[PDB]
Amino acid sequence: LKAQALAIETEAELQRVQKVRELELVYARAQLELEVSKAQQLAEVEVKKFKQMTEAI
Amino acid sequence: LKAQALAIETEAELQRVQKVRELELVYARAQLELEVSKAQQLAEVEVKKFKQMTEAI
């Protein structure tokens, strides 16, 4: 009887953990894209600033 | 009688451990792909910044 109750709690908990993980990966991939997009634009700002101040000298 | 009860708890517990392990490997492989994807993109940002600042001098 304990093996039946454990099988029920196992599948019920793993259905939750699977859905939480699917959503956290979708969000972490979107948040990664935002962090990379930030780094690409701010790195370009500093390269432009550096090149134009260098061309003045 | 103890050998029967032990065999029942053994198969019941190993059915849980197997399903937990199958899902943890699927998730850890997906999380690895995300960490590598982060490292590849952020390393490209730093390589671009370094090369363009070097070409200015």
d(CA B40, CA B47) in angstroms, rounded, equals 11
CB contacts, 8 Å: A2 with chain B = 9, 12
What's the resolution in A? 3.1
What is d(CA A33, CA B46) in angstroms, rounded to the nearest whole number?
A: 16
In chain B, whose CA is at the least distance from the CA of A1?
B8
Instruction: Determine whether the interchain pair A43/B45 forms a contact, defined as Cβ–Cβ distance below 8 Å.
Output: yes
CA dihedral B2, B4, B5, B9 (to 10 degrees): 130
Residues 6+ apart with CB under 8 A from B24: none
Distance of CA A32 to the CA centre of its chain: 4
d(CA B34, CA A36): 12
3-class secondary structure, A1: coil
Q: Are A7 and B13 in contact (CB under 8 A)?
A: no
DSSP secondary structure letters along B6-23:
HHHHHHHHHHHHHHHHHH
Residue closest to A24 by CA, chosen among B34, B22, B53: B34
**Structure-determination technique:** cryo-EM
